[PDB]
Amino acid sequence: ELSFGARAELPRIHPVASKLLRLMQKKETNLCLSADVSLARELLQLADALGPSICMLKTHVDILNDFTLDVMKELITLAKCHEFLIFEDRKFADIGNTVKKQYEGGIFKIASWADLVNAHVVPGSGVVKGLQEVGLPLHRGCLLIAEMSSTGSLATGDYTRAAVRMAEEHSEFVVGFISGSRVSMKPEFLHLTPGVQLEAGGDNLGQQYNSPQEVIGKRGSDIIIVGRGIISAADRLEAAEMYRKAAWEAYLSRLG
Amino acid sequence: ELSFGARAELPRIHPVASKLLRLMQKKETNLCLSADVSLARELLQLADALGPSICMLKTHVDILNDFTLDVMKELITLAKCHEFLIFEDRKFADIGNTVKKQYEGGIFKIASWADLVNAHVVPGSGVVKGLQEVGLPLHRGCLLIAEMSSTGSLATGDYTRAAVRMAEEHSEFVVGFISGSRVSMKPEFLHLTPGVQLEAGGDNLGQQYNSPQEVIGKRGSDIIIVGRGIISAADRLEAAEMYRKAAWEAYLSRLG
Numbered sequence A, B: 001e002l003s004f005g006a007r008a009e010l011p012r013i014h015p016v017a018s019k020l021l022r023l024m025q026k027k028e029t030n031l032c033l034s035a036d037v038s039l040a041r042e043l044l045q046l047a048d049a050l051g052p053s054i055c056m057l058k059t060h061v062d063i064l065n066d067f068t069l070d071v072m073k074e075l076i077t078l079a080k081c082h083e084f085l086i087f088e089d090r091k092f093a094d095i096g097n098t099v100k101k102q103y104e105g106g107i108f109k110i111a112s113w114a115d116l117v118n119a120h121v122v123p124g125s126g127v128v129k130g131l132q133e134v135g136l137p138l139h140r141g142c143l144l145i146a147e148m149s150s151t152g153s154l155a156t157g158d159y160t161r162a163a164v165r166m167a168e169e170h171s172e173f174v175v176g177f178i179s180g181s182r183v184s185m186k187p188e189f190l191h192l193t194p195g196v197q198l199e200a201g202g203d204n205l206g207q208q209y210n211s212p213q214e215v216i217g218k219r220g221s222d223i224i225i226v227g228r229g230i231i232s233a234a235d236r237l238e239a240a241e242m243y244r245k246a247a248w249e250a251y252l253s254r255l256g
C-alpha cells in the first residue's frame, strides 16, 4: 500500500486525483467537509475557516437560497488559497443526453466551477459518457456511487461490482467512488465515504454512521465526508480538526 | 382492467393520480411531453400550443438558462388553462435528510410548483420518507424509477421489485413509476414510460426507443414520455398529436 503522495504519481493517475492526493499529503488531511447549508455567507465562512483542515468541500448548490455564480467565484478563491477541491454532489442519474446538459448548462453551470461531480450508475455507462463529453474538455473528474450509507441501500453486490467496472473502464474521467469501503483494488481510484460521525448512531431518515477509524482503518477508504458532525457543532473549526486527526491517524496506522 | 376514468375513482387512489387520470380520460391523452429545452420562451410556447394534447409536461428546471420562479408561475397558468400536470424530473437520489432540503428549498423551490417529482430507489426508503415530509403537506405526489430505458440499466430484477415494494408501502405519497412496462399489479399506480419514438433506434449516449404501441399495448404502461420525437420535429403540435393518437389507441385496444 502506497502513501497518498506516491499514489499521486501513479502512471494511470487522473490529474484531478493527483492534485487531490498531493494536497492531502501536504496538509495531512483526508477530510471532506459536507457544507450542507442554505446561506452563501455561511458556506464561504466555513470554507475560509475550515479550508486549511480539509482536502475537499462538498457542495449541494441546489439548497443554497442565495446561489449566484459570484458565490462560486468566491468559493474558488478560497479553494485556491487554502488548497482544497470543490465537489458538487449533483448525483447525475439519467441517460447521457440529459446529464450532459445538466452538467454544463442551466443556472448552476456546474462544470465551470466543480473540480469533481458524482453520478449514480443505475442508468448504465451512458451516464458517464454523457458527463465526460463536457468534463474531459474542462479537465474535470467524476466519482461513481458504488455503495450508500443509508438503511435499505440497493447499492450492494452486483450493483457495486457494476460501478467498479464502469469506473475502471472510464479511467480518463472517473477518479473514484462514493462508497463505504475500498471497492476497487486499483490504487489510482479514490474512495470517499459519507455516513461518518465520531459517536454511534444515525438520523430519523435512514442515515447510518460509522467512525473515521472504522471507515478509513478497517474498511480501507481514503477520505471521510462529514456534514452534521461538523456543521451542527458550536465550534466547527475544532470539530473539523477532530475529524481530520481521526481520519489522518487511521490512514497512517493502516499504511504502517 | 379499468378505464383511466374508473381508476381515478379507486378507493386507494392518490388525489394527484385521480386528477391526472380524470384529465387523461377527458382529453383522450396519455402523452407526457418531455420539454428538454434551454429557453423559458420555448418551454412556455410548447406548453401553450401542446397543452391540449398532453396529460403532463415533464420539466428539467436545471437546464433552463433563464429559470426564474416567475417562469414557473406562467407555466402553472398554462397547466391550469389546458389541464395538464407539471412533473419535475429531479431524480432525487440520496438520504432523506438531503432530498427533503433539495425538494423544498434552494433557488428552484420545486415543491412550490411541481405536481409530481421522481426519485431513484437506490438509497432505500429514506429517500421517499424525506420527500414525503415536504410533499404530503403540499398535497404532491412522487414517482419511483423502477426501470430505465438506457443501455446497461441496473434497474432490473430485485432492484425493480424493491421499487415496487417501496411504492406500495408509501401509497400516501408515491403515485406510480418511471418504468418500461407495468411493474405493479395494483391499478392505483401510474406507469410512465420514457424511451419512446414512432421509429426504431436510439441515440449516441445509450438511449433506446420503443414505440407507443409496444410500450402501452404490449408492455401495459399508462403514459408515454416523449422528448426529441416531438421537440426536434419541425411542427411540434402535429408530432404531439401523432404520439397522442398512437398512445391513446394502444390504450383503447388493450382495454377492449
Ligand SMILES: NC(=O)c1cc(=O)[nH]c(=O)n1[C@@H]1O[C@H](COP(=O)(O)O)[C@@H](O)[C@H]1O
Pocket: A034, A036, A089, A091, A147, A148, A149, A150, A178, A194, A195, A196, A207, A225, A226, A227, A228, A229, B094, B095, B098
Ligand atoms: N452523495 C453523498 O455523498 C452521499 C451518499 C451516501 O451514501 N450518503 C450520504 O450521506 N451522502 C451525502 O453525504 C452527506 C452526509 O451528511 P451527514 O449525515 O454527515 O450530515 C450528505 O450531504 C449526504 O447527501
Ligand SMILES: NC(=O)c1cc(=O)[nH]c(=O)n1[C@@H]1O[C@H](COP(=O)(O)O)[C@@H](O)[C@H]1O
Pocket: A094, A095, A098, B034, B036, B089, B091, B147, B148, B149, B150, B178, B194, B195, B196, B207, B225, B226, B227, B228, B229
Ligand atoms: N427520468 C426519466 O424520465 C427518464 C428515465 C429513463 O429511463 N429514460 C429517460 O429517457 N428518461 C428521461 O425521459 C426523456 C427522454 O427524452 P427523449 O429520448 O425522448 O428525447 C429525457 O428527459 C430523459 O431524461
Ligand code: PRO
Pocket: A005, A006, A009
Ligand atoms: O516527494 C514527494 O512528496 C512524493 C511522495 C512520493 C514520492 N515523491
Ligand code: PRO
Pocket: B005, B006, B009
Ligand atoms: O363518469 C365518469 O367519467 C367516471 C368514469 C368511470 C365512472 N365514472
